[PDB]
């Protein structure tokens, strides 16, 4: 999946989490977010297509998904202990990061 | 260590987990798997020895080990809760990922 | 906010941890450490400034930060379970990883 599609997957599951009822839904959405973030590390945003795959710009891009992955880990750790409200609060901070990465590279 | 020896370490510890009797044994095996996966991320597998370390194929290889590392982390989270049987079930998914990586890159 | 400043942030929060009492203090210091390690992972350290960003040296540098990130995660897990003394013992060993990486690449 290209970068834009993976970002769409991230946002779709953020909405799933924000409207969620129980821990299971939150966990399944966070698991899909992790998979999308990892897949996006293999992608190239259109504006960086001319750059080296290991250029500092592309390193920045991939490590931005590492930042997201660690925030996803925190929310999923909260969700697996049944802390659904804390997991949703943390997902709200996930949306800020996702939006910032979207704005930076699109 | 080389990629192939890291892959042996992953397979060996998967067997350890399959037979494990308590949470400390599962945690220990998964910790060794994490070390081997991180070490393998610095390696070049046999299929990609004709590729540059910063080629897209090698970036994708390294992301594949990131994927493995996050699956290891899930099993380790179950084991840290003393849920031995759940963690062994999770390591079933690790086996699929490891075997797929073996077939793709050997 | 370059590599050297991140390594300083890592040492500062390590001192915060080694002189802490409750588990939330340790958690906050480890969370800032995680952020500093991730920022550093996208830097080029002084010793490698004359190397191609595609160099294997730079790949090894970045994987070394992944090793540090999982060590931070293990200490964070000990702290999230209330074992403040164990979190401080683990961070004692993080001190070595952090300062070794510092001295290696400065
Ligand atoms: Ca070669
Ligand atoms: Cl890379
Ligand atoms: Ni965790």
Curated annotation (Swiss-Prot), chains A, B, C:
One of its GO terms (molecular function) is iron ion binding. Heme b binds at residues 7, 102. GO terms for biological process: electron transport chain. Residues 38-60 are annotated as: Disordered. Binds 1 heme b (iron(II)-protoporphyrin IX) group per molecule. It comes from the Bacteria. The keyword Metal-binding applies. Its cofactor is heme b. Transmembrane segments: none annotated. Residues 47-60 have a biased composition (Basic and acidic residues). GO terms for cellular component: periplasmic space. Keywords: Electron transport, Heme, Iron, Metal-binding, Periplasm, Signal, Transport. It is found in: Periplasm. Electron-transport protein of unknown function. Monomer. Belongs to the cytochrome b562 family. This is Soluble cytochrome b562. It comes from Escherichia coli. The lineage of its organism: Bacteria, Pseudomonadati, Pseudomonadota, Gammaproteobacteria, Enterobacterales. The gene is cybC. The chain holds residues 23 to 128 of 128 of the full protein.
């Amino acid at each position: 999946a290209d970068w834009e599609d993976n970002m769409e997957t991230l946002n779709d599951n953020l909405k799933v989490i924000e409207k969620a009822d129980n821990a299971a839904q939150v966990k399944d959405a966070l698991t899909k977010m992790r998979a999308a973030a990892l897949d996006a590390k293999k992608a190239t945003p259109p504006k960086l297509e001319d750059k080296s795959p290991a250029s500092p710009e592309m390193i920045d891009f991939r490590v931005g998904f590492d930042i997201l992955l660690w925030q996803i880990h925190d929310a999923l750790c909260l969700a697996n202990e049944g802390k659904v409200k804390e997991a949703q609060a943390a997902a709200e901070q996930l949306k800020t990061t996702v939006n910032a990465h979207w704005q930076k590279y699109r």
